[PDB]
Amino acid sequence: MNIFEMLRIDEGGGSGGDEAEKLFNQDVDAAVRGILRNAKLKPVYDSLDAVRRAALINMVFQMGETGVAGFTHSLHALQHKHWDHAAVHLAKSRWYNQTPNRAKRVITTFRTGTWDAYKN
Ligand code: NI
Ligand code: NI
Ligand code: NI
Secondary structure, three states, X not given: OOXXXXXXXXXXXXXXXXXXXXXXXXXXXXXXXXXXXXXXXXXXXXXXXXXXXXXXHHHHHHHOHHHHHOOHHHHHHHHOOOHHHHHHHHOOOHHHHHOHHHHHHXXXXXXXXXXXXXXX
């Protein structure tokens, strides 16, 4: 499991072949670039382990860099590895209430630092 496999599960997968996967990879790259150029997201990203880095990329892939950067309080919790504190707030969001199954997987990934939520 990795960010690409993770996002394929959360997003559709399937449609379009190697040309479609170029667009997918480009969107993953754009998400990472969005993180690394944002003053609020980069220090969080830098502090995170490889598994939780994927979780953050996932959020930015879905909502965009400006959207994710709006989670100021949760991002602070993530930066100091207070996973449960972050989880409480992230679960109370437009994001969660619009895509609850995906958001729960992403949040659980933040909580555990494992890929267990994607083993199903
Ligand atoms: Ni602080
Ligand atoms: Ni602490
Ligand atoms: Ni709080």
